[PDB]
Write a protein that binds this ligand. Structure first.
Ligand SMILES: Nc1ncnc2c1ncn2[C@@H]1O[C@H](COP(=O)(O)OP(=O)(O)O)[C@@H](O)[C@H]1O
Lengths: 174, 408
């Protein structure tokens, strides 16, 4: 899979492909890997179980309800339980989350990570996307959305575990 | 507690009692003194004791009324004991400590009821949220905008606006409850449910005590009936016994109440007597000392009677009008009608036994017996009790003496 997040000109995005793989064959080709949270204010993408999601995203929402929209903190408070609670522990995934404030990755390890330029690229196709995103972001005036898109395609072209079905969630603010 | 001046007290007392100005001032000085005490220093606060009063006067002329309104006016615990109630304890009977107990069981039956007043808005505000929580089960962990749990006050505003009478819709809530029920009950089950949490123990029962000790008012009726009379001797020591028994109470002591230890050192005592047989100087020495204030009340006159009928707030006449209104009937008293009701009451009291203003309630009440009954089948009328009506209904009765001893 490949999750790509970018941020340029008061615009942030998260884009993902839709391939789920089992062994050497495709199980499904249209998996929704990018949703929306906290009353459609917070966007997110993810790599993992469809349930792990509908559990880690529900929780994340409540963590925001416990920290007035403040992304980061709810994010910190999130990765917190995710590494402690006996049960929540077995959950496996890689959440990419971003609000108008900032964007960041969360791993079952409990880490909260803010990448160089709010640029995120997780998943087996992650680096190829990063390489292409970085290239574009540094040599062209293209938009955050246009980036993630083009970057995602580049990925799906190189990564045997990434396809060309997309799911993007933008955000405007300025 | 009240910061009312004596003059203001008397004024306030004038709204319920006709005449007896002197007794009013005496009782008014007493109240103000309780205030005067707290404005003093450590020492002087122990030393200064209540100036207990000895009201002297004939039956039903306003003695208890005055003391009852005085108490009521200072939201003070009030008890009225009949002195002879203990004259039979030389054989068996109630101990005088009972007075301080009752003044306590009532100083509680008071602090409690007046906790249902203060806590009558709490259960129907920060407690009606119960039914609204099962009507629209709040967000899974409300967010937080100090106006977010107030935002609904749209969906939420509807369930509350419609909760202005519309109920009988069975639901359930939460030993919390859990049990399934209705609303003519789920709601009322909540009335007391959420209320017993605001009122605590060691402050309520502790305060009833603080009340009695600081604002208690004991009215010892017929204190003159426990004085020495020159007819015998054995019964006298029995009487004087009640005087010695009461002595600790007005001299300063500690009584045991099932709510705590009450100290009588600052309870105000209003003793009362007719003093036709005995004189206040027949009271034992120690008691005369503790009864520094002596005030007489005059017998009521026909004019006092006319005024008592209509002047006081919620006078019997006013009450009657009110009660007949309940039946949709408009009752009205002309000046001469009242002049005659009073006149009648005076007559019976002179021709038979004098019972003071009491007589007015019985005369007034016999006079109205007919309208009181027929009131329901007279709705929408203007009945006028005038001199004529009065005479037709009372004359015969008042005229016949033996009959007056029975019927009036
Ligand atoms: N001066 C008065 N003013 C108003 N009501 C009075 C007066 N005197 C007597 N009454 C009425 O008569 C009844 C007699 O009782 P009370 O007034 O306590 O006097 P007492 O203690 O001398 O018997 C009371 O219910 C009261 O309403």
């Amino acid at each position: 899979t490949t999750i790509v997040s970018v941020r340029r000109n008061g615009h942030v995005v998260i884009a993902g492909d839709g391939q789920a793989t089992l062994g050497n064959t495709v199980m499904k080709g249209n998996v929704k890997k990018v949703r929306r949270l906290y009353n459609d204010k917070v966007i997110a993408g993810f790599a993992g179980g469809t349930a792990d999601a509908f559990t880690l995203f529900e929780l994340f929402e409540r963590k925001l309800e416990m920290h007035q929209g403040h992304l980061v903190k709810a994010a910190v408070e999130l990765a917190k339980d995710w590494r402690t609670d006996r049960m929540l522990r077995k959950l496996e995934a890689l959440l990419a989350v971003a609000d108008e404030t900032a964007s960041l990755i969360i791993t079952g390890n409990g880490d909260v990570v803010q990448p160089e330029n709010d640029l995120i690229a997780i998943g087996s196709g992650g680096p190829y996307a990063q390489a292409a995103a970085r290239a574009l972001l540094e040599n062209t005036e293209l938009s955050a959305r246009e980036i993630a898109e083009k970057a995602l395609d580049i990925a799906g072209d190189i990564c045997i575990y990434t396809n060309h079905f997309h799911t993007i969630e933008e955000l405007s603010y300025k | 507690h009240s910061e009312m001046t004596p003059r203001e007290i008397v004024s306030e007392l004038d709204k319920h009692i006709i005449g007896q100005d002197n007794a009013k001032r005496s009782v008014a000085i007493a109240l103000r003194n309780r205030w005067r005490r707290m404005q003093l220093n450590e020492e002087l606060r122990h030393e200064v004791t209540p100036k207990n009063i000895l009201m002297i006067g004939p039956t039903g002329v306003g003695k208890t009324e005055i003391a009852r309104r005085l108490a009521k006016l200072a939201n003070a615990p009030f008890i009225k004991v009949e002195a002879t109630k203990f004259t039979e304890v030389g054989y068996v009977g109630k101990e005088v400590d009972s007075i301080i107990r009752d003044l306590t069981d009532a100083a509680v039956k008071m602090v409690r009821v007046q906790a249902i007043e203060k806590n009558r808005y709490r259960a129907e505000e920060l407690a009606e949220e119960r039914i609204l929580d099962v009507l629209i089960p709040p967000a899974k962990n409300n967010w937080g905008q100090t106006e977010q749990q107030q935002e609904p006050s749209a969906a939420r505003q509807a369930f509350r606006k419609k909760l202005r009478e519309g109920q009988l819709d069975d639901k359930e809530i939460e030993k919390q409850k859990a049990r399934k029920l209705k609303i003519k009950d789920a709601m009322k089950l909540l009335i007391e449910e959420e209320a017993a949490k605001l009122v605590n123990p060691e402050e309520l029962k502790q305060d009833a005590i603080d009340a009695v000790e600081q604002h208690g008012i004991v009215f010892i009726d017929e204190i003159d009936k426990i004085c020495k009379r020159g007819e015998s001797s054995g019964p006298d020591v029995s009487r004087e016994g009640v005087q010695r028994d009461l002595l600790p109470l007005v001299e300063g002591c500690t009584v045991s109440t099932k709510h705590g230890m009450v100290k009588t050192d600052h309870i105000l005592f209003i003793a009362s007597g007719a003093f036709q047989i005995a004189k206040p100087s027949d009271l034992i020495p120690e008691l005369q000392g503790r009864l520094p204030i002596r005030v007489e009340l005059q017998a009521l006159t026909t004019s006092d009677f006319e005024r008592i009928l209509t002047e006081p707030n919620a006078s019997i006449t006013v009450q009657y009008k009110a009660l007949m209104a309940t039946e949709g009937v408009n009752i009205e008293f002309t000046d001469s009608g009242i002049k005659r009701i009073a006149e009648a009451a005076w007559q019976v009291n002179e021709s038979t036994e004098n019972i003071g203003a009491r007589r007015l309630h019985t005369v007034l009440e016999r006079l109205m017996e007919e309208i009181s009954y027929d009131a329901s089948d007279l709705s929408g009328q203007n009945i006028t009790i005038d001199a004529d009506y009065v005479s037709k209904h009372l004359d015969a009765l008042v005229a016949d003496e033996d009959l007056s001893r029975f019927i009036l």
